[PDB]
């Protein structure tokens with residue numbers, strides 16, 4: 001769609017003078033605080049003045065002050081441009097940004113013998129990249145590879161705040177120049193067409209060389225994460241069944257809803273309950289062989305539906321990464337019985353066989369059966385992580401890594417076990433960090449230390465199945481630290 005209203009490298013003062021000079025009433029934009037990560041601002045001009053609106057994300061959701069909670073900054077703006085629930089404030093005209101730092105083809109300061117190096121070794125027909133001019137003062141050079149082969153270089157000028165290739169149109173930003181020639185490829189005089197199929201991959205690395213990449217990104221991480229965050233715009237899938245009136249009080253958060261293409265559909269429902277097929281949960285498929293279900297912390301009215309999912313999907317392990325109450329607010333109601341006790345959750349029956357307390361988690365062996373038939377009893381192993389902080393992320397990955405290693409071996413011991421149910425508060429942040437780590441680790445086991453891993457490609461592949469998997473840069477960097485830690489221990 002768009003998402004050009006997000007300006008990554010502007011301050012509070014600059015956002016005003018932009019909206020005050022190059023905008024009108026209804027203009028808006030989002031920006032991160034360069035100072036402290038996790039904080040974002042929504043600058044909207046109304047009645048000749050600008051109105052800044054703070055957005056906080058500690059690792060679970062984007063909390064709009066005086067508003068609601070959303071999964072992505074795209075779904076936030078999309079919800080308000082098509083509504084009014086923001087008091088009123090109007091999001092009419094998005095003030096686009098020209099800074100190409102978050103573009104996946106722009107590689108900033110990059111020389112020519114390095115550019116040909118990556119294009120020849122890792123490129124294919126259509127690979128391209130934009131870089132600052134290594135010859136000139138402040139211009140840019142486009143490099144395109146075509147074949148199965150050659151590498152054509154196209155010089156881009158900067159003439160009075162406009163970019164051009166030495167003839168034709170003068171574009172206001174590098175993106176408009178790139179996006180134009182991805183729509184109208186430059187054709188050389190001898191038939192060679194400069195096709196811009198896909199940007200050059202630079203994030204795909206061998207699993208062995210993981211420490212050196214973490215060494216580079218720490219000089220890096222913020223630039224690559226926001227580059228991935230800019231691609232959240234192509235993930236605005238439908239959430240109809242979640243927005244239905246009958247399902248409004250089944251979501252822990254009003255506007256954190258499951259995608260309609262991967263939502264878990266509750267079958268075998270009550271014929272007297274008019275609507276009993278919905279639950280805030282999504283199917284998670286890797287390389288999209290171990291599957292997942294990213295769901296939310298159970299409300300008091302969703303416990304029966306939650307257990308219906310664990311039964312209908314033949315799940316055997318539940319990974320919970322939140323305390324029942326954090327920061328004084330409710331994150332998840334106790335959906336399991338007390339130890340040595342037996343409870344009925346509608347049509348499902350659950351017995352707490354034994355509870356085992358470790359350093360960083362509690363293990364609850366549970367007995368799940370359906371009321372009626374005698375042979376439906378199955379063992380469900382709940383791994384309730386407790387040492388995850390309310391803010392930020394764990395500083396050392398060794399804690400969560402031992403956690404996932406015990407969860408993996410339990411899943412491997414069970415025959416035809418269903419998908420692993422993971423959930424935190426909203427079931428997108430901490431839950432997403434687990435699944436991505438468990439997905440990347442699961443690759444290292446089968447292929448070894450010498451294999452390809454693509455942290456952003458995996459996260460993007462998971463976000464296309466549930467809104468906003470992995471929330472903050474902290475979780476993004478933590479995943480890198482988690483993968484790196486797993487490989488140093490070999």
Ligand SMILES: Cc1nc(N2CCC3(CC2)CO[C@@H](C)[C@H]3N)cc(=O)n1-c1cccc(Cl)c1Cl
Pocket residue numbers: 100101102103104105106107108199200201202203223224225227228229231454456457458460
């Ligand atoms: C996350 C990511 N970062 C890429 N770069 C790193 C950063 C630069 C550009 C190159 C280079 O310096 C910076 C100015 C930035 N401009 C390239 C890239 O392809 N991904 C990606 C991978 C898989 C799935 C998705 Cl959705 C995405 Cl976005």
